[PDB]
Subunit: 232 residues, 4 copies
C-alpha cells in the first residue's frame, strides 16, 4: 500500500478504531491509530492554524493547532522518519466527511523542506487559483471562487456534503533524506475553516507525507481520512 506519515486534526472520535473519546490531534505513523494524540477543543466556524515540524537530529515530529483567543493543542512523537518514509516523498492535505460532515476549507498552506548534505523547497499558497497547476487534486478536492481549497465537497451555498474525500498534493516531489545528508527538516503550516450543521462534525483534515505516487486508497473514506485502506 502507500506509506503515510500524517498529522490528523480528527474532529470525529471513533473509539471503535482507537480514537480517544474527544476531538483530538494525532501523529499517525503508517496507521490511523495515532502513535500520540492530544485533546482538541475543536471550534467550528472559527479559522484555525496548524504548524507541523520535524528535523532529523531531534527526531521529534510535532504539531500545534490554535485559534485566535484560544488555548493551543500540541502533540509530539519521537520518530526517525527516514525509518518510515522513502527519501523522496509528496506532501499533501487530506480531509473526509462521512454521514456527519464539515467543510474542510484550507485558506493558506505553506511548507519548507531542507536537506543539508543546503538544498531546500518552499511553497506558500495564500490564494488558491481556479486551476492550480502545482497541486495534484485528488477525489473531491477543488479550489473555489474565494481562492480557497475545498478538500471535501461543499455546495455553492457553502454547505458541506457528506461522504466526501479529497486530497491536495504539492506537484513536485520533496527530497527528505539522502545517504549524504547531515540533517533534514521540514515545517508546514496551514489555516483551515471547519464549519458544520452537525453537533458532531466528521471526519477530519490532515497534513501528510507519502510515497510520491500516493493516491486515495479504496475504502479510505470517513474515519480513515483518505489516507489508509483499513484501520490497522
Amino acid at each position: 500500500a502507500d506509506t503515510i506519515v500524517a498529522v490528523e486534526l480528527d474532529s470525529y472520535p471513533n473509539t471503535d478504531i482507537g480514537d480517544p473519546n474527544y476531538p483530538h490531534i494525532g501523529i499517525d505513523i503508517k496507521s490511523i491509530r495515532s502513535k500520540s494524540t492530544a485533546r482538541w477543543n475543536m471550534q467550528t466556524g472559527k479559522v484555525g492554524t496548524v504548524h507541523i515540524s520535524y528535523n532529523s537530529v531531534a527526531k521529534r515530529l510535532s504539531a500545534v493547532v490554535s485559534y485566535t483567543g484560544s488555548s493551543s493543542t500540541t502533540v509530539s512523537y519521537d520518530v526517525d522518519l527516514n525509518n518510515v518514509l522513502p527519501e523522496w516523498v509528496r506532501v499533501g492535505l487530506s480531509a473526509t466527511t462521512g454521514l456527519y460532515k464539515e467543510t474542510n476549507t484550507i485558506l493558506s498552506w505553506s511548507f519548507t523542506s531542507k536537506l543539508k548534505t543546503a538544498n531546500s523547497l518552499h511553497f506558500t499558497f495564500n490564494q488558491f487559483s481556479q486551476n492550480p497547476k502545482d497541486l495534484i487534486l485528488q477525489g473531491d478536492a477543488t479550489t473555489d471562487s474565494d481562492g480557497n481549497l475545498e478538500l471535501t465537497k461543499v455546495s455553492s451555498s457553502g454547505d458541506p456534503q457528506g461522504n466526501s474525500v479529497g486530497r491536495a498534493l504539492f506537484y513536485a516531489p520533496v527530497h527528505i533524506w539522502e545517504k549524504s545528508a547531515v540533517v533534514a527538516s521540514f515545517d508546514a503550516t496551514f489555516t483551515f475553516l471547519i464549519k458544520s450543521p452537525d453537533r458532531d462534525p466528521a471526519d477530519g483534515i490532515t497534513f501528510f507525507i507519502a510515497n510520491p505516487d500516493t493516491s486515495i486508497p479504496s475504502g479510505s473514506g470517513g474515519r480513515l481520512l483518505g489516507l489508509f485502506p483499513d484501520a490497522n
Copy 2:
C-alpha cells in the same frame, strides 16, 4: 513553438545570427537575437555566479554575472513578461556545445517566485543528487558523482563533448502572473563552471522561462542554446 524568455551566457560570438563580436550575456525575448547584450569577460576554469531578477512593477528583467576577483557584467531589459509569457511556466537551465565545446557545469541553482494577489515558490539546489526527481532532465543533462548538474556531455575524465544539448527544468510549474495579482517577481541564482580545451569555447548556458510543456526544439543545438528552432 515554445515561448521562451532567457538570460544567456553566450561564450561563442556568432555574428552571423546577430551576436556581438565577443562573449556576452544577453536577455532573449522569444528570439536568440538578444534584445539587450553586455560584453562578458568569460573566464574558463573559474566558478562564476549569475543572478537574474524581475518584478512586475519595475518591468525590468536584469542579470549580473561575476567571478571572484573580477568585474561583474550586467544586462537589463525593460519588458512586461506578462505580455510575453503565459501565467504558468516552467523554469530551467539550458546549455549547448557545438564543434567547439565547453563543460556547462552547474554547481548550485536557486529560484524564488512570488505572486501577491503572498504566494511563493522557492527551491535551492546546492548538491544535485544522482536521480533528481524534482528536475525534468532533457537531452544530455545528467547529475554527476560530485553532485553537480552537467547540462551538456562530459567524459568521466571530465572532458566536454561536442554537439551536446541538455536542459534541467524544475518539476513544478511556476505561477508568474494571474488576473488578480498586484505584483509578481522572481529571482534566480546559479553557479557554473565552464572549462574548455578550446581557445573559443562554445556555445553557452542559459536560465530560461517557458511554457510548462517546453522541450528541446529540433534544430536547436549549438548557437540556439537548446531554446529556439531557428535564429529569427
Copy 3:
C-alpha cells in the same frame, strides 16, 4: 541633515510644496518633492498593502499600493541608491497628522535586504508587542493592545489626534552596499489602516531608508512626513 529615500503614501495634496492635486504615492529622493508620483485612490477604513523593491542591477525603485477589490497604484523611479544613500542605513516607517488627521496604523511590516559580494537581513512583524525591543520608536509612535503599531497618536476610543509625528526604525543597521558587492536588493511590505473623521485626511505614511543615526527633524511635522526639515 539626514539622508532620506522614501516611498510616501501621501493622503493630503499640498500643491504649495509640489504635490500633485490628489492623494498620491511618491518616490522621494532626498526631498519631499517626489521625483515620481502616481495618483492614489486612497480608501479610508480599508486595510491597504504596500510593496517596495529595488535592486542595484536594475537601479529602479518601485512601489505598489493596493486594497482588496480595488485597482493598484504603482510608481517607479530610476535611481542608483548607492549614489544617494550611505552603505549602512536604517529602515523605518514614518507618518504624520496635521490640522487634519488620520490614523497611521501599521498591522504588519516586513523587510528583506540582500547583499551579494549572499548576506541578508529579513524581519517580519505581524503582531507588534507592547515593548518592541527591535524597533526604535521615535516621536509619538507606540504599539497598541491589538498588536499594531500606531505611528501617530490615536485615543483609546481609536480616534486619530492632530499634529502628531511618529517613526519606527528597525533596530539593526542594514548593509545596502559595499565596495565588493555584485548586487544589492531590498523588498519591504507593510499593511496599513488609515481611518479619519476628515473629508481630507492628512498627512501620510512612509517607508524610508536613512543614515542609521536618523531622527525626526525639527519642523518636519505634517506635510514633511517626519522626514525632511523643509520642503526643498
Copy 4:
C-alpha cells in the same frame, strides 16, 4: 550574572570541570557543565559546519557538527527554553584560547527566529565586512581582510594567539517567546575553521543565546568559553 544557553564545540577536554575525556559538542544550560555531550572527531585545518535548532513545541534543542567526507556529531537536550531564557535575547558566537590555542574563524553565520502568536528575524553573513555595524564585537573578536570573523586573536601570518576571548552578537535583540505565542523556533548555522599548531588545541567555539545586555564575564577565558564566570 548573565543567563546563557549555548551549543559548545569544545576542543579541549577539561575533565576537572566535568568535560568528558575527548573533544565534544555540548548543550550548555546556564552552566559550562554540559547537560548533554557527544564525542566530536575535531578536525583541524578543515572547514566544519554546525546547525542548531529548537522549537517550543518539541522542546528539544539540538545540534549537528560535520565536515566534508566525515561522520557528523549530534547532540540533543530536552528543554523548554522559555523556563531558562528571558523573552528577548541576543544571539552570538563565542570562542576562547588558553595556554594551548587554535583559530576560531567563522566563515559564515546565519540565524532564523520565528514567533507565531508569524513574526521572524533572519540574518545570514557569508562575508563579514571590515566594520560590521550589525554585530556587537566583544573582547578580541574582529573581522579580517578575507571577510571572516576572527573570534579570538590571530596574527597577520594567520597564527592563533593564546589567552584570547572574543564574542560576536547580532545587534538586534531577538524575540524568542511571549505571552501570546503559539510556537517559537530558531535555527542557526555557522561554518568555522579551527587551525592550531598544538596537538591539543584549546579551547572551543560556541553559538549562544543570552540576556540582551550580555558581556564577556570576568574570569571567563579558556575553558569557560567567554560565557560563564565560573565552572558551577
